[model samples]
Target: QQCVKKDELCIPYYLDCCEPLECKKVNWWDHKCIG
Candidate 1:
């Protein structure tokens, strides 16, 4: 559950984020949430 949050490492497509936040492809591989 408490894996990752905004602006943190998240699985592609999985989008391990909380409300108001979502997976963001800030890079080519890994992803994060918010800005």
Candidate 2:
């Protein structure tokens, strides 16, 4: 993994953190439709 070319595809990494217990969560990854 030493050589990463500019044209190569890269994987996105997400954080392992979560919301607090008192917080309300919604569709975090939801996408809206266009009219």
Candidate 3:
């Protein structure tokens, strides 16, 4: 995987990391993890 992405809990893609729809796309190379 070259592009970096993650969930709300700072977990990587394709995993049960985010909850309550806290995870969102920040940019083309990043995501925003909400608390």
TM-score of each: 0.45, 0.25, 0.25
Residue-level lDDT tens digits of model 2 in 1-35: 23233323323332211222111212344322111
lDDT of 3 by residue, 1-35 (tens): 22223443333354332344435444566656543
lDDT of 1 by residue, 1-35 (tens): 65457777777666456756766665787677755
Alpha-carbon runs more than 4 Å astray in model 1:
1-3
Q: For candidate 3, what's the RMSD?
A: 7.6
lDDT score at residue 26, model 3, on the 0-100 scale: 48
Worst 10 residues of 1 by lDDT: 12-21
Best candidate per TM-score, number? 1
lDDT of each: 0.65, 0.25, 0.42
Q: Pick the candidate with the highest lDDT.
A: 1
After superposition on all C-alphas, the RMSD of every candidate to the true structure, in Å, is 2.7, 14.0, 7.6
Task: Give the least accurate 10-residue stretch of model 2, judged by summed lDDT.
Answer: 16-25
Local error of candidate 1 at 14, Å? 2.2
